[PDB]
Amino acid sequence: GPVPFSHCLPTEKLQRCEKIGEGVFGEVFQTIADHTPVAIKIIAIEGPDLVNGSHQKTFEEILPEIIISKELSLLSGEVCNRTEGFIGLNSVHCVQGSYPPLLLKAWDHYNSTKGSANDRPDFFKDDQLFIVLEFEFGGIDLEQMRTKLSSLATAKSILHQLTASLAVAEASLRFEHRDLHWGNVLLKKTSLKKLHYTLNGKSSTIPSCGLQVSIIDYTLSRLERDGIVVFCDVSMDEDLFTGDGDYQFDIYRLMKKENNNRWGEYHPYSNVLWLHYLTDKMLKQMTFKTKCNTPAMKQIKRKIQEFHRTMLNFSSATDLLCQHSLFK
Ligand SMILES: Cn1ccc(-c2ccc3scc(-c4ccncc4)c3n2)n1
Numbered sequence: 001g002p003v004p005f006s007h008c009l010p011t012e013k014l015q016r017c018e019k020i021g022e023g024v025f026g027e028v029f030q031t032i033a034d035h036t037p038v039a040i041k042i043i044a045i046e047g048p049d050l051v052n053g054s055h056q057k058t059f060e061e062i063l064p065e066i067i068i069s070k071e072l073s074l075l076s077g078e079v080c081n082r083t084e085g086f087i088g089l090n091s092v093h094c095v096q097g098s099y100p101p102l103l104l105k106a107w108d109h110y111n112s113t114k115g116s117a118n119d120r121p122d123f124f125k126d127d128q129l130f131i132v133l134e135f136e137f138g139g140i141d142l143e144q145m146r147t148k149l150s151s152l153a154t155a156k157s158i159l160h161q162l163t164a165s166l167a168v169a170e171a172s173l174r175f176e177h178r179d180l181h182w183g184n185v186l187l188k189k190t191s192l193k194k195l196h197y198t199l200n201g202k203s204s205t206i207p208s209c210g211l212q213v214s215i216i217d218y219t220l221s222r223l224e225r226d227g228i229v230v231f232c233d234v235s236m237d238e239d240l241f242t243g244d245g246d247y248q249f250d251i252y253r254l255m256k257k258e259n260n261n262r263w264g265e266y267h268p269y270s271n272v273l274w275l276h277y278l279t280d281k282m283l284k285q286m287t288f289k290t291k292c293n294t295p296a297m298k299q300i301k302r303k304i305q306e307f308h309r310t311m312l313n314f315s316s317a318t319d320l321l322c323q324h325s326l327f328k
Pocket residue numbers: 020021022028039041065069087135136137138139140186216217218219
């Protein structure tokens with residue numbers, strides 16, 4: 001059964017913890033094990049207390065996120081349908097105890113530097129259960145990189161990586177992310193010039209432009225094996241479908257329109273919608289350190305604009321990857 005925090009986070013690992021994200025779900029810390037950054041996602045479960053204004057998940061209610069995390073991580077090791085484009089999962093632990101004071105330290109630093117929407121997680125008792133997910137460190141989200149990318153060539157690499165990753169997960173797992181807003185796309189330096197994927201036994205490469213993309217956050221995600229479907233049933237959620245101020249909140253409505261409010265079904269067109277929303281962010285809200293000044297550059301720009309105009313007439317990330325001119 002469950003282990004103390006110290007089994008996941010021995011002192012040295014606790015001491016190098018630094019907070020890098022948060023949600024209603026809980027907290028994400030970066031730390032170092034064997035000279036290697038990792039991301040620790042910590043989720044309180046099974047307790048009656050509100051956390052960040054919401055009821056804690058049960059073990060059952062958190063299983064889907066663990067299952068989907070695992071399935072997508074394992075694609076990096078598969079043969080017919082292989083991608084590294086989802087965040088690697090290193091380990092999952094069920095932990096019991098009060099929140100480590102050293103994590104409160106890191107939580108405070110973050111709250112005074114960047115400010116938190118969360119409760120200070122200091123009210124947990126020594127019986128409190130958490131799930132600790134240890135992920136590879138995927139880098140920084142596209143939203144925080146709004147002003148940080150080199151050029152629209154980078155934008156194309158990112159759309160290519162995302163399209164291939166989703167297409168491999170479509171082919172393998174009948175996967176839909178269902179929440180791939182620009183907070184859920186992480187970017188990391190790679191020295192690899194070419195990134196590799198395999199779709200239904202056919203291997204290809206994507207120019208990195210120095211970035212490795214990692215997809216994160218499976219809150220809303222859906223996939224299946226041998227006809228067992230893991231999905232988040234939002235048929236009755238009301239809030240999710242009433243946002244505005246961003247194309248993001250249209251996608252929730254366009255998904256529900258596409259799937260007739262049946263979230264158990266496979267509608268890979270949801271992945272096309274999210275890729276459309278991301279293409280839209282690339283063209284409208286990203287600002288690049290270099291514009292498209294030279295001929296070849298304006299070419300790429302027109303191709304991404306042509307992608308923006310055309311991609312919604314494709315049925316899946318698989319259909320885009322295989323049939324869209326952007327990728328040829
Ligand atoms: C199921 N799942 C897989 C990753 C995630 C997630 C959620 C929120 C946040 S906020 C920051 C990260 C993160 C950053 C860097 N490297 C990995 C994860 C993050 N990761 N959830």
